[PDB]
Design an enzyme around this catalytic site. Structure first.
Site, PDB file in Angstrom:
ATOM      1  N   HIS A   1       0.901  -1.363   0.076  1.00 19.06           N
ATOM      2  CA  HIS A   1      -0.018   0.102  -0.018  1.00 19.06           C
ATOM      3  C   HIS A   1       0.791   1.111  -0.102  1.00 19.06           C
ATOM      4  O   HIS A   1       0.178   2.275  -0.323  1.00 19.06           O
ATOM      5  CB  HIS A   1      -0.796  -0.141   1.184  1.00 19.06           C
ATOM      6  CG  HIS A   1      -2.345  -0.688   0.854  1.00 19.06           C
ATOM      7  ND1 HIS A   1      -3.432  -0.667   2.070  1.00 19.06           N
ATOM      8  CD2 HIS A   1      -2.698  -1.179  -0.163  1.00 19.06           C
ATOM      9  CE1 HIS A   1      -4.321  -1.256   1.559  1.00 19.06           C
ATOM     10  NE2 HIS A   1      -4.017  -1.811   0.238  1.00 19.06           N
TER      11      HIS A   1
ATOM     12  N   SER B   1      -0.718  -0.556  -6.662  1.00 20.39           N
ATOM     13  CA  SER B   1      -0.691  -1.987  -7.207  1.00 20.39           C
ATOM     14  C   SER B   1      -0.325  -1.647  -8.780  1.00 20.39           C
ATOM     15  O   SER B   1      -0.285  -0.550  -9.068  1.00 20.39           O
ATOM     16  CB  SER B   1      -1.724  -3.003  -7.079  1.00 20.39           C
ATOM     17  OG  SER B   1      -3.002  -1.885  -7.591  1.00 20.39           O
TER      18      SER B   1
ATOM     19  N   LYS C   1     -16.328  -7.944  -7.184  1.00 20.37           N
ATOM     20  CA  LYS C   1     -15.498  -8.618  -7.942  1.00 20.37           C
ATOM     21  C   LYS C   1     -14.912  -9.739  -6.887  1.00 20.37           C
ATOM     22  O   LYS C   1     -14.806 -11.022  -7.180  1.00 20.37           O
ATOM     23  CB  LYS C   1     -14.483  -7.886  -8.846  1.00 20.37           C
ATOM     24  CG  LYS C   1     -13.612  -8.724  -9.495  1.00 20.37           C
ATOM     25  CD  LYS C   1     -12.720  -7.904 -10.470  1.00 20.37           C
ATOM     26  CE  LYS C   1     -13.330  -7.285 -11.681  1.00 20.37           C
ATOM     27  NZ  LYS C   1     -12.350  -6.440 -12.311  1.00 20.37           N
ATOM     28  N   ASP C   2     -14.501  -9.392  -5.776  1.00 24.97           N
ATOM     29  CA  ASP C   2     -13.764 -10.167  -4.832  1.00 24.97           C
ATOM     30  C   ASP C   2     -14.940 -11.220  -4.359  1.00 24.97           C
ATOM     31  O   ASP C   2     -14.772 -12.240  -4.006  1.00 24.97           O
ATOM     32  CB  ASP C   2     -13.348  -9.319  -3.539  1.00 24.97           C
ATOM     33  CG  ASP C   2     -11.967  -8.782  -3.778  1.00 24.97           C
ATOM     34  OD1 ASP C   2     -11.734  -8.938  -5.126  1.00 24.97           O
ATOM     35  OD2 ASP C   2     -11.660  -8.294  -2.908  1.00 24.97           O
TER      36      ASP C   2
ATOM     37  N   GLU D   1       3.608 -34.919   0.465  1.00 24.46           N
ATOM     38  CA  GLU D   1       2.439 -34.383  -0.263  1.00 24.46           C
ATOM     39  C   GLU D   1       2.570 -33.804  -1.461  1.00 24.46           C
ATOM     40  O   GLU D   1       3.800 -33.483  -1.996  1.00 24.46           O
ATOM     41  CB  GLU D   1       1.682 -32.910   0.865  1.00 24.46           C
ATOM     42  CG  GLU D   1       1.695 -33.499   2.273  1.00 24.46           C
ATOM     43  CD  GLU D   1       2.882 -32.723   3.096  1.00 24.46           C
ATOM     44  OE1 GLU D   1       3.924 -33.015   2.325  1.00 24.46           O
ATOM     45  OE2 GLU D   1       2.749 -32.477   4.192  1.00 24.46           O
TER      46      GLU D   1
HETATM   47  C1  HEM Z   1      -0.306 -15.712   2.774  1.00 26.92           C
HETATM   48  C2  HEM Z   1       0.297 -15.584   1.725  1.00 26.92           C
HETATM   49  C3  HEM Z   1      -0.063 -14.165   0.745  1.00 26.92           C
HETATM   50  C4  HEM Z   1      -1.082 -13.281   0.907  1.00 26.92           C
HETATM   51  C5  HEM Z   1      -2.023 -13.318   2.022  1.00 26.92           C
HETATM   52  C6  HEM Z   1      -0.592 -12.377   0.048  1.00 26.92           C
HETATM   53  C7  HEM Z   1      -1.541 -11.294  -0.168  1.00 26.92           C
HETATM   54  C8  HEM Z   1      -1.172 -10.380  -0.950  1.00 26.92           C
HETATM   55  C9  HEM Z   1      -2.424  -9.209  -1.466  1.00 26.92           C
HETATM   56  C10 HEM Z   1      -3.883  -9.155  -0.460  1.00 26.92           C
HETATM   57  C11 HEM Z   1      -2.133  -8.229  -2.384  1.00 26.92           C
HETATM   58  C12 HEM Z   1      -2.442  -7.381  -3.258  1.00 26.92           C
HETATM   59  C13 HEM Z   1      -3.693  -7.602  -3.695  1.00 26.92           C
HETATM   60  C14 HEM Z   1      -3.312  -8.228  -4.844  1.00 26.92           C
HETATM   61  O1  HEM Z   1      -2.611  -7.773  -5.646  1.00 26.92           O
HETATM   62  O2  HEM Z   1      -4.330  -9.249  -5.454  1.00 26.92           O
HETATM   63  C15 HEM Z   1      -0.593  -8.799  -2.638  1.00 26.92           C
HETATM   64  C16 HEM Z   1       0.395  -8.510  -3.693  1.00 26.92           C
HETATM   65  C17 HEM Z   1       1.444  -9.292  -4.166  1.00 26.92           C
HETATM   66  N1  HEM Z   1       1.947 -10.343  -3.635  1.00 26.92           N
HETATM   67 FE1  HEM Z   1       1.266 -11.654  -2.301  1.00 26.92          FE
HETATM   68  N2  HEM Z   1       0.135 -12.695  -0.986  1.00 26.92           N
HETATM   69  C18 HEM Z   1       0.716 -13.941  -0.314  1.00 26.92           C
HETATM   70  C19 HEM Z   1       1.612 -14.660  -0.867  1.00 26.92           C
HETATM   71  C20 HEM Z   1       2.636 -14.138  -1.777  1.00 26.92           C
HETATM   72  C21 HEM Z   1       3.798 -14.918  -2.470  1.00 26.92           C
HETATM   73  C22 HEM Z   1       4.334 -16.373  -1.780  1.00 26.92           C
HETATM   74  C23 HEM Z   1       4.576 -14.205  -3.336  1.00 26.92           C
HETATM   75  C24 HEM Z   1       5.622 -14.325  -4.161  1.00 26.92           C
HETATM   76  C25 HEM Z   1       6.372 -15.157  -4.006  1.00 26.92           C
HETATM   77  C26 HEM Z   1       3.602 -12.772  -3.340  1.00 26.92           C
HETATM   78  C27 HEM Z   1       3.734 -11.858  -4.137  1.00 26.92           C
HETATM   79  C28 HEM Z   1       3.142 -10.591  -4.374  1.00 26.92           C
HETATM   80  C29 HEM Z   1       3.351  -9.356  -5.509  1.00 26.92           C
HETATM   81  C30 HEM Z   1       4.471  -9.489  -6.439  1.00 26.92           C
HETATM   82  C31 HEM Z   1       2.386  -8.788  -5.248  1.00 26.92           C
HETATM   83  C32 HEM Z   1       2.232  -7.363  -6.029  1.00 26.92           C
HETATM   84  C33 HEM Z   1       0.669  -7.145  -6.498  1.00 26.92           C
HETATM   85  C34 HEM Z   1       0.835  -6.150  -7.768  1.00 26.92           C
HETATM   86  O3  HEM Z   1       1.731  -6.393  -8.495  1.00 26.92           O
HETATM   87  O4  HEM Z   1      -0.063  -5.484  -7.968  1.00 26.92           O
HETATM   88  N3  HEM Z   1       2.480 -12.976  -2.467  1.00 26.92           N
HETATM   89  N4  HEM Z   1      -0.419 -10.087  -1.968  1.00 26.92           N
END
Ligand code: HEM
Ligand SMILES: CCCCCCCCCCCCCCCCCC(=O)OC[C@H](COP(=O)([O-])OCC(O)COP(=O)([O-])OC[C@@H](COC(=O)CCCCCCCCCCCCCCCCC)OC(=O)CCCCCCCCCCCCCCCCC)OC(=O)CCCCCCCCCCCCCCCCC
Ligand SMILES: CCCCCCCCCCCCCCCCCC(=O)OC[C@H](COP(=O)(O)OCCN)OC(=O)CCCCCCCCCCCCCCCCC
Ligand SMILES: CCCCCCCCCCCCCCCCCC(=O)OC[C@H](COP(=O)(O)OCCN)OC(=O)CCCCCCCCCCCCCCCCC
Ligand SMILES: CCCCCCCCCCCCCCCCCC(=O)OC[C@H](COP(=O)(O)OCCN)OC(=O)CCCCCCCCCCCCCCCCC
Ligand SMILES: CCCCCCCCCCCCCCCCCC(=O)OC[C@H](COP(=O)(O)OCCN)OC(=O)CCCCCCCCCCCCCCCCC
Ligand SMILES: CCCCCCCCCCCCCCCCCC(=O)OC[C@H](COP(=O)(O)OCCN)OC(=O)CCCCCCCCCCCCCCCCC
Ligand SMILES: CCCCCCCCCCCCCCCCCC(=O)OC[C@H](COP(=O)(O)OCCN)OC(=O)CCCCCCCCCCCCCCCCC
Ligand code: HEC
Ligand code: HEM
Lengths: 64, 70, 49, 242, 60, 386
Positions: free
Chosen positions: F206, F210, F232-233, F276
């Site tokens: 934030h 994004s 949408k969500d 798994e």
């Molecule tokens: C419990 C695990 C995770 C949660 C709760 C989570 C949640 C989120 C949320 C809510 C967003 C912003 C909303 C969205 O863009 O959909 C986001 C963005 C992002 N997440 Fe995660 N995520 C998780 C795991 C990961 C992992 C494992 C990676 C990479 C190895 C990752 C990489 C990213 C990236 C690169 C963004 C950028 C969004 C954009 O480019 O606009 N996330 N994450």
């Protein structure tokens, strides 16, 4: 009583006559085994897979 | 994190003055044709190696099994 | 309906279970005691005066 | 290609299907077959007596049947382990005292527990059925060491247990010809019920909630389109060519 | 149609009435779908139930 | 200032929630590939609630664990629903996060100024893997015992400190009750750290906003979050619930191995030991090497490359729509990663050794190649100009 399952297993010969004759050729070829460690297990499995697949859809109708 | 001066003009219409559902199924075949023609290469590149490797492994295994028999 | 289903299921998961409820009805033998004194006996999980 | 063991086909079981239930008469006859043939070496130890009421017997039958057997109970005031007949809250009795005795009485082979025997191997139902009905004559060129029997549905080709299901091994109370196949079918139905006693409740909840949630998905899609209609038909003029 | 407008004017000039309407609709639709699925379940497989074994009371 | 109050949603009490959920500006051309972060948040919450209610009926001892799980399933009202939700929600959670990662790889979301987000995501992935592996043990079946043995004895390949750290980890000489109780406590603890890392991840995102399917500047056309992306969500959540409940109610054992319904027996070994379905790529990469030290130290390049992607600094176009070659490489990498997954569940002989040794080479050539397009394409405006 008489087993239905064995009745159907002896019925299904025409389905894999081919596997049956293959196994017969196998046993006639191995005939004369000297050292052991020669067998016809693959043709056995092929044959009984044929018979089981034949009996599968037919058997359970006859039962109760 | 800021904004920019823009100079544009826009017109809009209320939600309750326009048909909503009929837009989904309007002209499906041309959309399907466009998607296929655009992403055939991606589909090919995704699904090629899997098929090749699977066929190769199946062939090798059956050849080995049938060569071990008596 | 979904909210009600989940709340009720999670709440009912914590109530007494079938194994515990099966052990709730039987009697044992009791015997004589000295004048005016007390010796308890044994039951499900609860004594007897 | 002998170390894995033959493959058991797929059979049309009366409890398969998305809206199918148990055949309770088959459960009754399977329990009879188990208690009269199989409880000699195997054990359940997970299924209690009270499970059967409402499923295959009324309560009084189960009460008398449980009062048949004798089980031990904790110390009295004296301090001795006595015995008294069974109740509704007892479990299916075991034939041995431990695993060591079990191996001793079978030639070093341990006969497993049959509570979960359908879920534990691959393709449970059909495996157990074809295993029971699969003892056969060994193929040419192979031999089995004495004290063992042949079965293609076992990984290894040689098994320890001897065949039990034989024509007339039990006598039903409904007048059904106790063929090996009928007995095997009843046994497998009983064992499947024993492993998965929750199947029918599961399937009912599943049908109801899949239907309801599909309706909710339809409503949410409409909601989405209605909200986005205003932006998705907006028109703007921008004053640029390339 | 006009029935939609009539329903709208009857139910949604307040909000507590809306909450009550939602609760009532939920706890009626639940019962209706329960009845429907139970009836279909009974219809699909006749004769297999627990009260359909012919020897249920002959182990006295 | 506004010397008299206007709204409850702009008061100090609700300022944080309002600013970061309701009025936050987002691009207006986000597609359905941007819902999986929220969907994974809901998956984590489901896991936590279901686990807190399973842990009221489970006893961590070697004599009792198996029978207590079966007691839950057979004797508690609805307990089968709790166990099936837990054991299948782990799989759903891994599925959703894999899709999230591949979304991030496609539209090149790791580049500036969003590399802190990528690094925190990698850390979150490590915590997820550790938590799932530690929690697959407490049922105490056959695969629990033997998977714990193999994986945690893979740590004696390290030089001199090896046997010491293995014996300290096991709490003794073999996988027994001490390891069980230890792993139970770790399993109850780790998901709260997972929650904290998720909140930090969201704050880090934030503070810059994004990306979008175009990869351009997006400060001229933005819309609020509510009600435009809330609905949408909502669509996404309902579809996910349908899928999850198809798993729970009509096929709850397809995604597991049958051998975990046999109580642990240290003397006999199963003929085919695997973990798994969501550890098989790592497992295949790990067994791909005919050397213990090399096999263990080949996982380290995986995490080093995943953690060092963001710091190449020549590429100028983010989205793969305008990058044909990188798009093709993305699809080919996806195919190769699936191939590793499939190989990780096979016996180790011909013809699987070669097909288990080459896909790691491809999986590393991906992280080697990408800077070369960076350089060779930095000078593209000068050649194609009109
Ligand atoms: C419990 C695990 C995770 C949660 C709760 C989570 C949640 C989120 C949320 C809510 C967003 C912003 C909303 C969205 O863009 O959909 C986001 C963005 C992002 N997440 Fe995660 N995520 C998780 C795991 C990961 C992992 C494992 C990676 C990479 C190895 C990752 C990489 C990213 C990236 C690169 C963004 C950028 C969004 C954009 O480019 O606009 N996330 N994450
Ligand atoms: C007092 C002030 C009230 C207020 O401020 O209202 C705000 C606001 C309405 O404000 P408003 O401006 O006054 O109303 C205008 C609209 O007409 C209001 O209309 P609306 O569009 O905002 O209402 C839509 C809402 C209508 O419902 C309600 O809001 C009332 C209930 O629909 C839902 O809440 C769907 C329920 C979510 C359940 C989905 C669960 C996902 C999968 C579950 C697990 C799957 C396994 C099986 O209320 C909401 O928007 C509700 C938001 C709910 C989101 C919470 C997320 C919950 C997810 C946790 C589940 C995790 C799993 C646990 C296990
Ligand atoms: C090997 C490298 C082959 C490509 C070498 C440069 C060719 C440049 C090119 O334009 O290739 C086009 C082709 C697909 O790109 P395109 O023409 O846009 O097809 C869209 C159809 N819907 O090809 C591509 O863009 C991707 C080529 C695959 C790269 C494979 C690398 C290994
Ligand atoms: C478990 C792991 C499963 C992984 C699933 C793969 C997930 C990949 C996410 C990739 C993100 C994505 O949506 O790619 C979109 C891509 C083109 O979409 P785009 O060019 O951005 O939009 C144009 C609008 N007409 O879409 C395509 O290029 C179409 C390719 C489809 C080929 C498969 C058939
Ligand atoms: C009307 C309201 C109720 C509707 C209920 C519908 C239930 C669907 C059927 C449930 C079921 O048992 O599916 C069996 C299936 C077997 O698994 P499998 O052999 O892997 O089939 C996949 C083949 N690609 O198991 C599954 O494949 C589950 C996965 C379903 C989603 C696949 C897309
Ligand atoms: C498994 C064992 C792992 C052991 C560690 C392995 C580490 C391997 C990492 C290799 C990758 C190289 C990392 C190099 C970091 C610094 C490189 C860099 O470019 O920093 C400079 C840059 C700003 O400098 P700049 O403006 O470009 O230079 C001005 C010149 N006039 O700086 C920036 O742009 C700021 C970017 C900050 C975002 C990165 C912050 C670190 C990553 C966060 C993850 C850590 C969070 C952990 C949370 C739990 C802690 C236990
Ligand atoms: C991985 C974290 C390191 C844990 C570890 O290596 O423990 C080994 C040892 C502590 O236990 P240890 O000394 O082996 O007890 C046996 C006494 N004869 O290690 C030690 O003796 C001191 C450990 C200090 C380093 C901890 C790093 C975290
Ligand atoms: C990032 C990607 C992460 C994905 C992780 C899992 C990848 C797939 C794992 C897997 O095991 O799928 C292969 C599946 C298993 O087959 P199975 O019969 O269990 O193994 C032989 C034992 N008799 O066999 C299947 O075909 C099921 C389909 C799974 C998805 C397709 C797998 C792609 C490769 C298949 C063709 C090669
Ligand atoms: C003679 C005592 C005895 C009888 C009675 C008995 N079994 Fe067995 N059973 C054994 C032994 C011994 C084994 C172990 C086989 C081995 O390890 O080779 C076994 C194993 C099994 C297995 C495991 C097969 C596998 O693949 O692991 C099944 C299933 C089985 N029995 C079913 C039954 C059924 C059904 C009945 C009732 C018809 C029954 N048994 C009755 C002795 C018996
Ligand atoms: C406070 C959080 C949690 C608690 C208290 C908890 C509790 C438990 C308990 C008691 C068990 C053993 C019961 C059983 O195996 O049936 C278990 C198993 C398991 N847990 Fe959790 N859990 C939590 C969170 C998580 C999370 C976040 C994950 C994955 C990301 C996870 C993955 C698993 C898995 C895969 C199993 C294996 C169950 C099986 O395969 O049968 N748990 N958990």
């Amino acid at each position: 009583p008489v087993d239905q399952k064995k009745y159907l297993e002896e019925s299904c010969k025409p389905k894999c006559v081919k596997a049956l004759l293959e196994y017969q050729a196998c046993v006639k070829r191995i005939q004369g085994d000297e050292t052991g460690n020669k067998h016809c297990t693959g043709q056995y499995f092929d044959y009984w897979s044929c018979i089981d697949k034949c009996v599968a859809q037919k058997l359970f109708s006859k039962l109760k | 994190k800021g904004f920019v001066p823009m100079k544009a003009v826009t017109y809009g219409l209320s939600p309750f003055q326009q048909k909503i559902m009929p837009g989904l199924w309007k002209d499906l075949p041309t959309k399907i044709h466009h998607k296929v023609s655009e992403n055939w290469i991606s589909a090919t590149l995704l699904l090629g190696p899997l098929v090749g490797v699977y066929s190769y492994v199946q062939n090798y295994q059956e050849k080995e099994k049938l060569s071990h028999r008596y | 309906s979904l909210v009600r289903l989940l709340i009720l299921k999670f709440v009912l998961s914590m109530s007494a279970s079938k194994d515990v409820l099966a052990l709730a009805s039987l009697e044992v033998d009791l015997s004589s005691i000295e004048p005016g004194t007390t010796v308890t006996v044994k039951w499900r999980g609860k004594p007897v005066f | 290609e002998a170390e894995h063991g033959l493959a058991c086909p797929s059979y049309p079981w009366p409890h398969q299907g998305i809206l199918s239930s148990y055949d309770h008469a088959s459960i009754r006859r399977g329990h009879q077959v188990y208690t009269q043939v199989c409880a000699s070496c195997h054990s359940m130890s997970l299924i209690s007596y009270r499970d059967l009421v409402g499923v295959a017997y009324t309560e009084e039958e189960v009460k008398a049947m449980a009062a048949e057997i004798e089980v031990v109970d904790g110390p009295n005031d004296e301090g001795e382990m006595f015995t008294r007949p069974g109740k509704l809250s007892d479990r299916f009795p075991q034939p041995y005292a431990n695993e060591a005795a079990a191996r001793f009485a079978n030639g070093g082979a341990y006969p497993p527990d049959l509570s979960l025997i359908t879920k534990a191997p691959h393709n449970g139902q059909n495996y157990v059925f074809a295993l029971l009905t699969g003892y056969r004559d060994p193929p040419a060129g192979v031999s089995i060491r004495e004290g063992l029997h042949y079965n293609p549905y076992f990984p290894g080709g040689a098994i320890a247990m001897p065949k039990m299901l034989n024509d007339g091994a039990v006598e039903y109370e409904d007048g059904t010809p106790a063929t090996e196949s009928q007995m095997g079918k009843d046994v497998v139905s009983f064992l499947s019920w024993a492993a998965e006693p929750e199947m029918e409740e599961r399937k009912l909840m599943g049908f109801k909630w899949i239907f309801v949630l599909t309706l909710a998905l339809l409503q949410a899609g409409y909601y989405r389109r209605l909200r986005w209609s205003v932006l998705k038909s907006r028109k703007l003029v921008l004053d640029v060519v390339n | 149609g006009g029935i939609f407008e009539a329903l709208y004017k009857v139910l949604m000039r307040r909000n507590s009435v809306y909450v009550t309407f939602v609760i009532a609709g939920a706890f009626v639709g639940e019962r209706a779908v329960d009845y429907g699925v139970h009836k279909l379940w009974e219809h699909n497989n006749v004769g297999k139930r627990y009260e359909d074994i012919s020897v249920l009371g002959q182990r006295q | 200032m506004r010397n008299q109050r206007f709204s409850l949603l702009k008061q100090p009490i609700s300022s944080t929630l309002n600013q970061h959920l309701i009025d936050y500006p987002t691009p207006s051309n986000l597609s359905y590939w941007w819902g999986f972060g929220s969907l994974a948040g809901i998956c984590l919450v489901i896991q936590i609630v279901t686990g807190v209610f399973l842990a009221m009926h489970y006893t961590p001892h070697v004599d009792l664990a198996f029978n207590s799980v079966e007691h839950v399933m057979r004797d508690v009202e609805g307990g089968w629903l709790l166990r099936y939700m837990h054991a299948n929600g782990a799989s759903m959670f891994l599925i959703v996060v894999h899709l999230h990662i591949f979304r991030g790889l496609y539209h090149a979301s790791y580049s500036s100024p969003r590399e802190f987000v990528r690094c925190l995501g990698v850390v979150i992935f490590l915590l997820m893997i550790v938590t799932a592996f530690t929690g697959y043990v407490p049922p105490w079946g056959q695969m629990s015992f033997w998977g714990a043995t193999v994986i945690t004895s893979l740590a004696s390949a390290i030089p001199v400190v090896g046997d010491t750290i293995v014996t300290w980890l096991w709490g003794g000489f073999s996988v027994d009750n001490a390891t069980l109780n230890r792993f139970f406590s770790l399993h109850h603890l780790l998901p709260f750290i997972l929650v904290g890392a998720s909140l930090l991840h969201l704050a880090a995102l934030h503070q810059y906003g994004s990306n979008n399917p175009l990869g351009v500047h997006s400060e001229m056309d933005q819309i609020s979050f509510y009600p435009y992306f809330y609905v949408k969500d909502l669509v996404g959540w309902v579809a996910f619930a349908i899928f999850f409940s198809i798993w729970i109610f009509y096929a709850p054992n397809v995604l597991g191995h049958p051998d975990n319904y046999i109580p642990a027996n240290p003397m006999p070994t199963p003929p085919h030991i695997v973990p798994e379905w969501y550890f098989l790529p790592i497992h295949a990469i790990l067994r791909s090497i005919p050397d213990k030290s090399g096999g263990v130290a080949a996982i380290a390049p995986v995490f080093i490359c995943l953690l060092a992607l963001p710091f190449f600094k020549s590429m100028y176009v983010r989205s793969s729509s305008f990058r044909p070659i990188h798009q093709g490489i993305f699809w080919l990498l996806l195919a190769d990663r699936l191939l590793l997954g499939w190989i990780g569940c096979q016996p180790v002989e011909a013809p699987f050794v070669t097909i288990g040794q080459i896909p790691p080479l491809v999986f590393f050539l991906f992280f080697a190649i990408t800077p070369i397009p960076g350089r060779v394409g930095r000078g593209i405006p000068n050649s194609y100009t009109d």
